[model samples]
Target: GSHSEADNYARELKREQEEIIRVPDTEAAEVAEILARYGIEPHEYGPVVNALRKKPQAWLDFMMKFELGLEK
Candidate 1:
């Protein structure tokens, strides 16, 4: 494929990914809060969060663990 064709394919893949798993505002807020409470910054955790975005349940589980830890 030509360079332009490859670029178009990449864009299409990004569009599909966004459609499949765009995090909601509320969830994003909660993630920020969790990171802050743990003394970590968003940029530091961005990679992990982005990875977990592909699995919504995994993301929720991570948040739940922190919340539960705080309760202890």
Candidate 2:
């Protein structure tokens, strides 16, 4: 019998891998919700949400608070 073995990983890196497994639509939904709070209309921010989906790195960056930094 094989026993389960787990290795410790960074929460940041862990979520990055988890993001790749999670269906992308879920992440996009959060992008929209995040944008919604800023008083933006779908027509305006819809592109930003879909655009973010274009790259995992970008989405990953957004997931880690680049979204706030980007508002600058």
Candidate 3:
């Protein structure tokens, strides 16, 4: 009943968590597909996916970097 900020944060964060939990396999597939479409191939997939599994942050970066790949 006090700060809606916390509520909003929780709401947004909870929704993010729910999205990840709801269809994690789908997300993983979607991300892998994105990589495969651009720079990564099914072969090197092991490196990116395996390497990312070790750190959640790297996974996010891989998705961000390759998916949105900066302008050349």
Candidate 4:
């Protein structure tokens, strides 16, 4: 019973994370269209823009945005 309860809790947590707003690739044209509609300039960057991808702090900062509550 305890194991089953833990599994359900973990599943719920993961579902919550997927609920956040993500910039979709297929909708990129639509995204740009909306930006242009408002007279906004689009800034494009390289695919792997962050040079600090391997840094611990970079991962921590990204996780913190989701409020994962992990301690340093």
Using lDDT as the measure, which candidate wins?
2
Name the lDDT of candidate 1. 0.59
Note the Cα lDDT for every prediction shown: 0.59, 0.69, 0.59, 0.41
Worst 10 residues of 2 by lDDT: 2-11
lDDT of 4: 0.41
Per-candidate clashes, comma-separated: 0, 0, 0, 0
**Tens digits of per-residue lDDT for model 1 on 6-67?**
67645654544354357555565666677778888878877766777678656655554553
Pull out the clashing pairs in model 1.
none
Off by over 4 Å in 1: 1-23, 68-72
- Each prediction's RMSD over C-alphas, in Å, is 14.2, 7.4, 6.3, 8.9
lDDT of 3 by residue, 1-72 (tens): 387656755555555446546875654675678778777777878566666656755554554456545211
Candidate 4, superposed: residue stretches over 4 Å from native: 1-3, 21-72
Q: Which sections of candidate 3 miss by over 4 Å?
A: 1-14, 57-72
Off by over 4 Å in 2: 1-9, 66-72
User: How many backbone clashes are present in model 3?
Assistant: 0
Model 1 misses residue 24 by how many Å?
Answer: 2.0
TM-score of 4: 0.25
> What are the per-residue Cα lDDT tens digits for candidate 4 across 1-72?
256756764665455334322432322343345445666655532222233234534533444333444332
State, as a TM-score between 0 and 1, how close model 1 is to the true structure. 0.45
